[PDB]
Design a protein around this ligand. Structure first.
Ligand SMILES: Nc1ncnc2c1ncn2[C@@H]1O[C@H](CSCC[C@H](N)C(=O)O)[C@@H](O)[C@H]1O
Ligand code: NA
Lengths: 265, 265
């Protein structure tokens, strides 16, 4: 008579925690969504096989409009699991689903999993130095999103790093690359000219975190905007003022230009 | 010839990922540290038993001063694992360890696990809204540090939430409670008097993140400062202005007072 929100992790079905696996294995019904993020190293079949259950994948509409109609009803007589990439409550609106669970008289539990939010640590940038986060959204029609631009400005002014979640259009199998994010930002810059994102802006790219050989690159936009970082998902980071050890890591590990060592502090 | 940085997760021995467990099991030597944080929901014996490997515990000094003499040499002819609570490389000085590894001609890989940074998503607060993070440290002798107070100030001023880690003495197994941190912040407020942290300030408390039964409480300081949040470790969060959705979650899930729906939104 309970509902479990269980994260699947960063890259493949093995990024699920042992706790999440044990529980997922003993659930009567298992649902899931693969629109909030992309797990580039696995397939539904592999996940199903690992857990030993058939998985009913739900779409955004099913979830946002009919969660209480498709999932909750079952969480009354059986134990139900709802799986998601990464951590279920990070950079999603899934937290509100717990309210629906409650209002429906259903107990819910959350099993965390490695998230891109903490995986930034592999970039060598101190995680406590990150400021407000943002999402680079694909423009659609005449509507051209720009708010993410100001987040960077506000953080950079405070010497804080900016984590940039990149857009997703799962139904169309479209995953924004760091390259596309950089192009969009240059356009916003050219429009606002606030000094925030230019060819000389040093950025960090993390691609396919959770895999054994993710792509970790750092450098100036002008040099990275056309570089091939491999398949999605990707995240773009605009570092603020760097500590010396951060610069050393970005250089020795992320192939950054030695001149960034000059923190110019 | 390989070094594995493997995350142990949040609370107990099942918080490690499936990938992390399998890789550890195939390693010839297994090290771990519990000075940055502790796995309050388990024990070394249970971790050793689950992994089925002998685990050598390293002190802060063993790591910071002698990592290249204790861990790296064994990684030249064997597969070695280095276990840390949470997600690897989150602790400020751990990234630099990969640099030490490279310098010694040792390949290193990162196996992620849940981190409090992402786990706090269970509080209902939107992750993108967190600003700079800080640690509340106890004063000592003539040293009265208060920077964490300024972090809260700068963040809140911009509508951002502040994640506050509470001081800990690993060796002594002595944690700072949420109640203690609040008293300290009130003392710092009485000194700086910046109208940042008062009896009227609204805060969130998270304890035992990772366990199936964590403690998530929200409310005003004057009602929570003497409340019992359970066994450590505790995490304190000073939210900035709330999105109505965030407040509804704190009210419905964290037992927050209806009052926040109008006062802090
Ligand atoms: N393994 C990975 N590597 C790089 N970026 C990733 C990633 N997983 C997620 N992201 C980034 O985050 C976006 C999804 S946002 C949802 C995040 C998820 N709940 C988590 O906890 O990680 C992607 O479009 C991408 O920009
Ligand atoms: Na953060």
């Amino acid at each position: 008579m309970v509902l479990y929100f269980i994260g699947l992790g960063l890259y493949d079905e093995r990024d699920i925690t042992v706790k999440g696996l044990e529980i997922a294995k003993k659930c009567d019904y298992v649902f899931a969504e693969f629109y909030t993020s992309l797990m580039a190293g696995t397939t539904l079949g592999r996940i199903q096989k690992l857990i030993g259950k058939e998985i009913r994948v739900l779409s955004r509409e099913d979830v946002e409009l009919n969660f209480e109609n498709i999932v909750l009803p079952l969480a009354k007589e059986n134990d139900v699991a709802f799986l998601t990439p990464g951590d279920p409550l990070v950079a999603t609106t899934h937290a509100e689903l717990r309210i629906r669970a409650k209002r429906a008289g259903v107990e819910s539990y959350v099993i965390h999993a490695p998230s891109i939010y903490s995986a930034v640590g592999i970039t060598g940038l101190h995680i406590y130095k990150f400021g407000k986060s943002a999402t680079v959204a694909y423009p659609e029609g005449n509507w051209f999103p720009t708010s993410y631009y100001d987040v960077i400005k506000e953080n950079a002014e405070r010497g804080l790093h900016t984590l940039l979640f990149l857009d997703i259009k799962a139904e169309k199998r479209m995953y924004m690359t760091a390259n596309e994010a950089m192009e969009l930002l240059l356009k916003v810059e050219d429009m606002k000219k606030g000094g925030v994102f230019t060819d000389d802006t040093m950025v960090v790219v993390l691609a396919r975190a959770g895999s054994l050989n993710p792509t970790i690159r750092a450098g100036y936009v002008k040099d990275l905007i056309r570089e091939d970082f491999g398949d999605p998902p990707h995240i773009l980071i605009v570092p603020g003022k760097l500590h010396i050890v951060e610069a050393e890591y970005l250089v020795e590990i992320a192939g950054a230009p030695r001149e960034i060592l000059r923190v110019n502090v």
